[model samples]
Target: DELLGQYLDFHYGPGHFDVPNYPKACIEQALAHHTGTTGRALDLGCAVGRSSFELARRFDEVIGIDLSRRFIDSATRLAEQGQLQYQVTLEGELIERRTADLAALELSNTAGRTRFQVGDACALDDTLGRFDLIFAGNLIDRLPDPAAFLAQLPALVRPGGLLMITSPYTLLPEFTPRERWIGGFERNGQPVRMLDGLRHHLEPDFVLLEPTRDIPFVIRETTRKYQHTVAEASLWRRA
Candidate 1:
């Protein structure tokens, strides 16, 4: 419940604390780099479905898949009901009630164009099919086998489709084994960054797009406390 509340606000909040809406920025950047069909888009690790809903504004169809069933259920409800009531921590035991409305954000129409599902990014359903654009926001570092997950992406996107991966590369043993980490350590006494790891796995089937971006996001822990983070966003096109 705590996580659900935090993610809902993170996805739907109106730029609180002067922070830009990260999910909204993601889809906008994806559109800017898009050069293929707009028929379909996929949001991997879609937390509460904000990015997926945003994609529905332009794409004919959008699918949001996440590993958390609770998150997916909340997203599905919002898509069907067009509104959701949630709580946010104010301080200590104090809290406040808030409502998230799709209509208010001009996303009511997008509800019909989007769908949510609970699934593992590392083991996506083979029948899920290919997409014109695929977005995995802040997800790579959280996976157990990021390399395996990266290998699966090439097949999930069309030849000319765009792939956007945004990550802070906060590798933690709780989420990823040290051996499975993409980078952030020494390799043959040489410093290897996450971007290098991405290229190693993706270059065979994809080309990195120019002008990589840094996306800023804020997560409110309380009325005054917040977690400010920047994620490196890179766009790639399947070859």
Candidate 2:
């Protein structure tokens, strides 16, 4: 399997410190400070579509696109059905049955405002056009050509619109080629931080917002085992 399991855990997991975080909490926290205008939104690498559904509350429409066919299928299913069935692991031989309910998640009203598709961020179609907001979650470092994607972002957003990129910056040759990393390595003998690379790449058309924050997340592997992660958030306004 590519990640976690069954695709519904992230959107449906009963999150707590002992469990996982609520679907919106894990993702929407990064955008809590971003109360900006919205007409149309693009949730890039939308995994299973909870964030897309969440954004529909603020935007007229939201399109959640991901790379995996099965993932988008799950998202599309949720968008159409308003509920889904799945399971989570409690221990080696134990399992917990679960269901993701749009009504329970406070999403019953907006699920119809969202849609899902399989798409590549690095090569997003120009015909897809500009958006009022572009949300990139746990996505940049995983791109096969992150810089190319970054280079093209300016044109995808209208001025004053926002770009939210939240990532742990977990880089590896497996997710991104050594040549594509924004810089956890020496660049021309000077160290390059991910923030610095983002600034350098985004400066031409965007300005970083104030007080960047870390959105802490927990991915449950079992009842007691967890992947505690703090993903950094950078909100930029298209200049």
Candidate 3:
């Protein structure tokens, strides 16, 4: 709640991961083009588990995986307890307490359909193999090697399944090495944007099935602080 003010009143709404939530928004947008219900789904970088709950609406089972145990534990607690109780910062030295109950959200049933696990995104094994839907919300730029993970998606996703990739394309060497970056730099004579890099890598195996771009989201930090960002919510169908 310190980094993300869950209940703090703010001008900008929620998206990405902060107060509001980009994960839920992206999931809604991506599913607009999806035609079928999923048998299984994987929510990568699922921080506090909202996306996993959303996925449970369609899939028989949903597994939410994250790198941080703190977030995973919080998600599990929220799932089992029905409410996510936490503290939020209003300003310097000022804080507020908050709780979001799934009963009110009408998502209390997701606890039975969803499971949370702490694991590395790039190191997932076959035990978690073959999903019908793979949602990577705001996960591309944050990964240490998105290409390596991307290489593995064709195996994890079943034929004709959906892969939703949402990102702002904000890259830093801290999360990705310069040489391993699939996009956001000069390749040959032109710029290698994230979308183009994705096309290059995901081609033949995964078809870009329209609605390939455009979605706006808001992220709130404090009561006064806000970030208005447009995330690229791309839809791809596995072949």
Candidate 4:
């Protein structure tokens, strides 16, 4: 399990997948597409709350849930610092008449409005409640049972809610029975097409809103060393 642990640390830790524009763009897209009262939003597998905090802008209340305690702790600290800076800027903007700081004014006090917790994605009922929009980024492929994980998402989202999932279809060696990571072997008989497997489970309960393929973006130079392939982003609605 050393390899698995190393993979988790590399991918989930500090600066690996925390691309600023990526999560910001996803949140913006979700805000534009989903129609709701803008009340509660959920960020599943929300490592360090980067996406969750961004979502706090669009929703009255936002909650981020993850299984990793380290991730949760880091997220809480980031959220607190973000909120404090937001408050300070807001006060400054209100006092200054000539220069109107739009960004600060927009960052209203969501104190007690946003929550972050350590919880499992497969069993969200007991911890996180229903939401208007739920973000599941780079989570399905990592799950032991992708189908079961997808099955649980619908119940967590209210009727007419939105579910946005993004994943890079890179089959890790551990996840596959094969002894090595295959870059793009079309005929390599794997148990499941990681991306397709998730779609199969989602199709039954949700309507696909946007199905994007071959999304081109950069991982760090370090990531390029690994044989990574195309990325997929799917936006779905609860029917």
Query: What is the lDDT, from 0 to 100, of the residue 10 in candidate 3?
Result: 24
Q: After superposition, how far is residue 235 of candidate 4 from its true place, in Å?
A: 0.6
Candidate number that wins on TM-score, 3 or 4: 3
**Candidates ranked, most accurate by TM-score first:** 1, 2, 3, 4
Write candidate 3's Cα lDDT for 141-209 as tens digits.
Answer: 999888888888888888888899989999999999988899999867899899988988898899998
TM-score of each prediction? 0.98, 0.91, 0.90, 0.68
What TM-score would candidate 1 get against the native?
A: 0.98
| Separate clash counts for every candidate | 0, 1, 5, 0
- Steric clash pairs (candidate 2): 15-20
Residue range 1-239, candidate 1, lDDT tens digits: 87788888898976876878999988899998899999999999998999999999999999999999999999999999999999989998899888888888888887899989999999999899999999999999999989889989889999999999999889899999998888899989998999999999999799998778899899887888888999999999999
Q: By TM-score, how accurate is candidate 4? A: 0.68
Where does candidate 3 stray beyond 4 Å?
4-21
Candidate 2, residues 71-183: lDDT per residue as tens digits? Answer: 88878777788887766777886887777788887887888889888889899877898888888888898999989889988998888788988888898999899987886
For residue 154, model 3's alpha carbon misses the true position, in angstroms, by 0.5
Clashes of 1: 0
Question: Against the true structure, whose TM-score is highest?
Answer: 1
lDDT per residue for candidate 4 within 1-239, as digits (tens), equals: 22222232333222334343455556777777898668889888887565676688768888888888876765575456543111111131232112212134343345346688888776666655688889887776565545556778778789899988877855555654343222234445755455555566777678888556443333332323332334577888888
lDDT of model 2 at position 54 = 83
- Provide the lowest-lDDT 10-residue window in model 4: 84-93
